[PDB]
Design an enzyme around this catalytic site. Structure first.
Site, PDB file in Angstrom:
ATOM      1  CE1 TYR A 151      -3.111   3.038   0.852  1.00 35.32           C
ATOM      2  CE2 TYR A 151      -4.525   1.105   1.170  1.00 35.32           C
ATOM      3  CZ  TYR A 151      -4.368   2.467   0.951  1.00 35.32           C
ATOM      4  OH  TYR A 151      -5.478   3.264   0.839  1.00 35.32           O
ATOM      5  CG  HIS A 195      -5.636   4.462   5.187  1.00 30.38           C
ATOM      6  ND1 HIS A 195      -5.486   3.840   3.965  1.00 30.38           N
ATOM      7  CD2 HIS A 195      -5.918   5.759   4.916  1.00 30.38           C
ATOM      8  CE1 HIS A 195      -5.661   4.724   2.998  1.00 30.38           C
ATOM      9  NE2 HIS A 195      -5.923   5.897   3.547  1.00 30.38           N
ATOM     10  CD  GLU A 249      -3.241  14.773   7.192  1.00 30.96           C
ATOM     11  OE1 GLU A 249      -3.668  14.946   6.024  1.00 30.96           O
ATOM     12  OE2 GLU A 249      -3.138  13.626   7.703  1.00 30.96           O
ATOM     13  NE  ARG A 286      -6.725  15.583   5.283  1.00 29.39           N
ATOM     14  CZ  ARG A 286      -6.915  14.244   5.180  1.00 29.39           C
ATOM     15  NH1 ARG A 286      -8.087  13.601   5.267  1.00 29.39           N
ATOM     16  NH2 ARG A 286      -5.833  13.529   4.976  1.00 29.39           N
ATOM     17  NE  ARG A 288      -7.283  10.790   0.108  1.00 29.73           N
ATOM     18  CZ  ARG A 288      -7.104  10.624   1.419  1.00 29.73           C
ATOM     19  NH1 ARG A 288      -7.558  11.528   2.289  1.00 29.73           N
ATOM     20  NH2 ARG A 288      -6.472   9.538   1.866  1.00 29.73           N
TER      21      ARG A 288
END
Lengths: 666, 666, 666
Positions: free
Chosen positions: B81, B106, B337, B352, B403
């Protein structure tokens, strides 16, 4: 100035144009077709089509770049003879599958039914996967497949067994397997009180008893993790056996959860159909509906030739039940390898012509799954190629490739045993116009036919549509000789460049694209097949498990701790027995030996050693056991034979023997 | 005809144009922007931008091919990943670095902080390198990094430790290392008489005691080859300790020489910062000056949120000293972030947004590194993406990716669990105008979101400028399911297609290119990761050292002469112990055994042999020692136990025993 | 508005046009040449050439995209220092060959003469093949080659031996081998009664005694399969020895059959020419006719410097006989590395100039193989590059590359030790007009010079024509430093990024293409170098034989059944002796040992075991032999030394000894 009306001879005007314009200028043909008596420099045109009669009376069309929105890809690059996508390609849940056969020749020697897949709409393709092993009775017989497709979420394939000697068909079997899927579902799991099975409602699941199913977030006690199908209730419902039971009913209605499935963890269901009478090859696949499908076939070994299909009306409950349907008798001669598809209640079938000097490929349609037909002949004896196709709107879009250059036309002789550039063509036919008289075959790409053997891996492809693109997957060669006539008469793929045939895919736009480009240039190290990472010590590291079946030569080898909480390094030897031996040395055979050591170095100082001397050693077949203790556990220390060998010798005396009793001498 | 004024509805005119022109014609929009009520066939346009309000009130812009001078590249292709370039990219000495994390999810499971690099301005990328190992306490915790960059010739990274169970921050440490460089210098080395140190003058060397330095052509005795830094005098001067001393002063002024640094041969300097309070993630890196840098951070686990930066004013002398500076409190809700960069005395920060239904990403500038701020809110709740950026002339150029498809807009619901094509955008903002009300997000490329799990690897990238190109490095998926819901709930990368997330790079022209093209088509065999060469015997040969850590199955194995002037073949076994054993045979378990031989064949004729019989053997656990001599060196031949086993037996008598004295019986 | 007349300054008009047009617009220069005082943004132009005087009085030309129909390819990507195609390229039976040297530096350390090949007209290239091994006397000397080509179906190469220390020439040998080909023939095999030889008629076969020949379908008894040439009768006929003889004459007149040659299975013929006096390098290769060829040379070590060729009039019968021909004395100063080709009775020679401040490259033609010449000097001191070329119609088409940016011009100083973008040029010279005063060097691509060392691998290439395309194969670097000044002074290719030099190929259209495009995008997993297939059990499987010569670390290892109808697994150890040992354990040295087992586990319950204890074990150098039987076959059980060690001990008594006679005590 050129007319571009498809009829006026535009040769002179085009020539004058080219002579009067800079070589770097892209001459725009404005979408028009230009008739010519010789092909000009096609590379200098964009958005142009030419009509040209290489053979008089037989116009073919030639596309400049950008005339069609299309692009060729190379999709395999493997030393095997990789050919025959015919006629097995399909798309399933956004993945494009290109099945083929990887062998060493036209025949089943070394053959694995294989596929590569694309997960990005054809830009990039996967490492080849073998779908079959070599047949148990190899090398007498081995597998073969030209018919594969998906029906109700299962892959079905006609797996044939054929002789290595003559490629003679020996057996037909239907193999099927559930496709891998992830399902995100709401409700549908119930578990009745006082028993342990849960029934799962999954419409058209396509699973059988024993098939793999994985559960996440079921909210039903005992329905969790990796399980198997226990029973199948009907096409929309199956059960699993859970470890436990409850005194009240469970029902996860309204709850979101995930399933489920695995092609790789589920067994094939194999249905032996025997040696189906009057069949040479089963080829092509057409899903009919939720219950079944048709597969094409021909018989071309004895007279009379047949071409048709086998319809399997309920492949789920009754995989052994098929019905033969043939095309009309006038179309059977000189025909083989039909491509079949089914749209809106109409079954379409296109044949391969077997010779350029007899009537060739013909197109057929049936509204009763092949019981009756409406038929048409393509003009000019189309031959040597299958014509896989899909239906997009009213149009059948079909692709074909000549096997070697200049073989396509009627009356054109086979031209083998010399390198050449075979043409690949496509054509459109509107099904509401049902006539091929004025069909336009458009040359969209040229391949290579190597010429080192008579056979060609070019073409014999397969067609699929995904979204607004059509895909033609087909073989093509390169100029690297397989050396069949040469040093590789055994056709070993792993010598020199192996076999030049590999798969290509032409991707052609078939409808509007209402998104910005997804195209990329590939600039990565391909790191899927042998995944390599530079570790923190700067050394190439491969973490994937791997199998090397070919002969391996290694240099200095360290076996690292790997086993039982990494306490030990481990080598395991398979077979009936293992052999660890010592070659005859090149320079000093008188030193031939192996040293086995419990310590780090050749010095006996580092650990106990056993040294086995070679027969070529100065000390022929000596063994030296060197340790600070020699302890023989669990058994007497005995000579192999009786009264033949001794303990010690006159020049090698033991000091004494420590015994619990006097020797027993006899 | 179409107006191309960005306001007039040009839908109908564009459709008429498309209906009336050949599909292969590239319709040139002349760099204009055309308002449409539905996106047309974008693929048929060049040099065209469309404005379209998919969600009314929210105009976005869509570029056709050639509207921007830009290209997408795929830059990793690994089964891990591979995601989260955020926000670590940098360029150093003409090399572009794209660090990321390669995991299985994740989370920090199986994670290595990694990078790939390009040495040709983005055309081709290197084999992935692992920058971190798995944490010593794996699998309880593992490393994680979203902040990395270069200051005065050293790489600095905030290496966090996080739990596998919840991705909870446990520790932050600043790790730094010197970058590898070659320096071509004249003079600067001096060595005082009667002592062993030489002082090296290298402006802003950025080296610490113990760091690697290599010397060539120094003209100073003792200053030669691979050395380490002995002392640092100041930021421009350091010493090395040479082997010898001399009675005269050395000074190499006027002489050309070469040095000499190494990232790989120098240790990390690790400064444990503990669990920095009120921090969820450290993210992004802004070099301030020759002494220090800032890193972004946010806290988002509990209320209230913090978003801001840590400024390390002197990271060379005082890596543990930093000051926290938060953005204004109104901009912290639903923010995380931050991307930060420093240009000409100005620190720019972009957050973000975490929610499509709440105020989103904002932009901030400061002239005192975050003590005071001027602030701006992007319209329409920009969310789910970081907005990495660079400053080129008067503009911030920022990139973002949704996303999953159709998530960008304010009010747009998350849309997961189904494959889609997420849009990637960029925008320019003039810093003098300082107003985002009319920002124009231009969709330049579309990625794939796989949909097999809720998480997405798309986007969350990083931006760098090199020469006249800007580069956006970011994640993208493909249609290959990881089978998390399926047969790979364990998320093993090496099963099937592994994880679909890999890295891409969008390369955009940002200024004039006064050179002829450097571009090439890659047509080589990638031969860096596993370098193979066909040897003179026609066999694939890999000369690089290599580690295989996954389970290996081998066929026939030859260990070649490799060691001690190639006198011997060698296998070393590591761990506490080595084990060489024999599997239970499938067909003939009664044959189970290993033959060890000092010669070339299974026949004892070729050399001395010891055969160990398996428990499954007909002769269960037998050992046969077969040599023409059996010589026991260094120790007595003894039974393991006392008065338990014998020498010889009634049917296996030794002829005699040769002794120096009578047996000792007791 | 710009004039585009090659003379009027168009700088300002071009700036105005660029400022007034959208950046995405391709500005069409209509194939005109534009004079400018500074190069504009070339990327925004198509079909445009610029003239620009970077150094006043030295105009060079610069091509936009599409001005020439050409494309750059990268064709190697290997960690070796890959450079010097000069001047060895050729085409043979449709395969483009690009030989080069892969070493670790400018010199013969680690060097193999190598090639890659293209089988699809340059789109895709093969895995590197080594043509030479390391010299027997490595590391004192090693091979080198800059002259290679084909004459009558044989590869001829001048294989030089040079010192590693100084790259000094030590020996010259002509090496030759038959090229692999498949022949499809009719008749020509005869076998006289009562003798075993068959004579084979193959015009210009170019085979020698002992060369490989394979026969298929001969229709002549015993002429079948893999054979070797027994005698050569003349250039068109040879014999092979068959296994048998018949009593009547055989003749396959009229029958179609196939042969059968192999480069790999035929030995080199190596003709030692010794140290050819007055030669620095042999370079370039021109086939003259059916019997021989010429090879270029220069001598540049001592006065007088020479440049010329060696003509081998009959290399088949007389490979040791050659004649030295020099170019006219005025052109020999400051010249080296001549490129030579022969067309229609004319021998052409172009020199490399050695410095930019002296008269440089010159062109020569001869109608008597170098005895007399007509000559011309290129303007402005062309230097540092060879000028490989081909003749296409009336033009010589030549290619060259500066070695680092801005070195091309007369008077330009070398600019090394910094990264730069060297320009590559081509030019046309009409041989009828025979005047180079107004030659036009056109910059068509830019490469990278890394700058980490003074040496450059850029350029020094080679040229071939195949069909309507010309191919320039040459070196280029990337920005990845070799770390020679750094942690890799040893220049090991397998550390970090190895050596940045690799091969490229500029493919340029030179004649009309009357075919549709063969171009494809490569989308495959490269599966030739390490062929990987996912097996039916889901594991990556490599079936190719492979050699790993670098140090290998392995994890868990299984040796599978492989040998003697797969009855056994097998490990063979080479060298004088084999060693299997045990490293010192990191955590528990006290446990150091290896267990050898005839069964599947560590438990002695699974099989007979011998355990060798390390010196670091608590039981230092112990051996435990654990079996249910211990049988010593073929020899006495003896102590190594006489009267030193015992049988048993006071705490380890054997119960008794079974003997055929009393002990012999002495």
């Amino acid at each position: 100035s050129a007319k571009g009306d498809g009829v006026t001879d535009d040769t002179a005007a085009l020539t004058s144009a080219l002579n009067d314009t800079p070589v770097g200028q892209k001459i725009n043909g404005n979408g028009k077709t230009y008739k010519v008596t010789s092909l000009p420099d096609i590379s200098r045109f964009i958005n142009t089509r030419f009509v040209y009669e290489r053979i008089p009376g037989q116009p073919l069309y030639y596309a400049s770049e950008e005339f069609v929105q299309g692009e060729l890809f190379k999709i395999t690059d493997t030393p095997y003879y990789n050919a025959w996508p015919q006629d097995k390609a399909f798309v399933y849940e956004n993945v494009i599958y290109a099945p083929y056969m990887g062998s060493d020749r036209h025949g089943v020697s070394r053959l694995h039914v294989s596929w590569v897949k694309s997960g990005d709409d054809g830009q990039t393709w996967s490492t080849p996967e073998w779908l079959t092993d070599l047949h148990p009775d190899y090398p007498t017989v081995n597998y073969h497949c030209m018919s594969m497709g998906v029906c109700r979420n299962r892959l079905f394939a006609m797996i044939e067994t054929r002789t290595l000697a003559k490629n003679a068909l020996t057996n037909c079997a239907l193999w099927d397997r559930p496709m891998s899927r992830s399902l995100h579902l709401t409700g549908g799991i119930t578990k009745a009180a006082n028993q342990r099975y849960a029934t799962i409602h999954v419409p058209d699941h396509g699973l059988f008893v024993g098939d793999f199913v994985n559960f996440s977030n079921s909210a039903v006690t005992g329905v969790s993790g990796d399980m198997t199908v226990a029973t199948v209730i009907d096409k929309d419902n199956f059960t699993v056996l859970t470890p436990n039971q409850q005194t009240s009913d469970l029902n996860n209605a309204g709850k979101n959860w995930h399933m489920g499935t695995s092609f790789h963890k589920s067994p094939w269901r194999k249905t032996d159909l025997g040696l189906i009478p009057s069949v040479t090859e089963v080829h092509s696949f057409a899903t009919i509906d939720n219950n079944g499908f048709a597969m094409g076939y021909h018989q071309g070994d004895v007279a009379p030739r047949e071409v048709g299909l086998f319809y399997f009306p309920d492949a789920f409950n009754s995989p052994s039940n098929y019905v033969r349907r043939q095309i009309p008798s006038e179309y059977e001669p000189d025909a083989s390898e039909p491509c079949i598809k089914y749209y809106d209640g109409v079954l379409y079938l296109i044949t391969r012509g077997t010779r350029g000097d007899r009537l060739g490929s013909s197109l057929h349609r049936s509204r009763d799954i092949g019981q009756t037909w409406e038929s048409l002949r393509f003009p000019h004896n189309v031959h040597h190629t299958t014509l896989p196709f899909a239906k997009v709107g009213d149009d059948l879009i079909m692709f074909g490739s000549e096997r070697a250059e200049n073989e396509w036309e009627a009356g054109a002789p086979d031209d083998r045993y010399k390198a050449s550039y075979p043409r690949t063509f496509y054509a459109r036919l509107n099904v509401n116009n049902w006539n091929a008289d004025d069909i336009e075959w458009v040359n969209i790409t040229d391949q290579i036919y190597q010429g080192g053997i008579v056979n060609s891996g070019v073409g014999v492809g397969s067609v699929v549509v995904k979204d607004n693109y059509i895909y033609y997957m087909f073989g093509g060669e390169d100029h690297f000789n397989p050396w069949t006539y040469g040093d590789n008469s055994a056709k070993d793929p792993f010598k020199s460049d192996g076999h030049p045939s590999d798969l290509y895919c032409y991707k052609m736009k078939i409808g509007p694209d209402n998104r910005v480009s997804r195209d990329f240039r590939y600039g990565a190290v391909p790191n899927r097949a042998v995944p390599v990472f530079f570790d923190t010590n700067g050394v190439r590291t491969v973490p994937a498990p791997m199998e090397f079946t070919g002969d391996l030569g290694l240099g200095h080898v360290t076996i690292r701790a790997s086993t039982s909480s990494n306490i030990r390094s481990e080598v395991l030897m398979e077979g009936e027995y293992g052999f660890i031996g010592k070659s005859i040395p090149t320079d000093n055979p008188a030193g031939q030996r192996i040293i086995f050591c419990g310590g780090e170095g050749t010095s006996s100082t580092t650990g106990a050693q056993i040294t086995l001397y070679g027969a070529n050693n100065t000390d022929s077949r000596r063994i030296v056991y060197n340790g600070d203790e020699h302890l023989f556990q669990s058994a007497d220390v005995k000579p192999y034979n009786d009264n033949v060998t001794a303990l010690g010798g006159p020049s090698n005396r033991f000091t004494t023997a420590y015994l619990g009793s006097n020797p027993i001498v006899t």
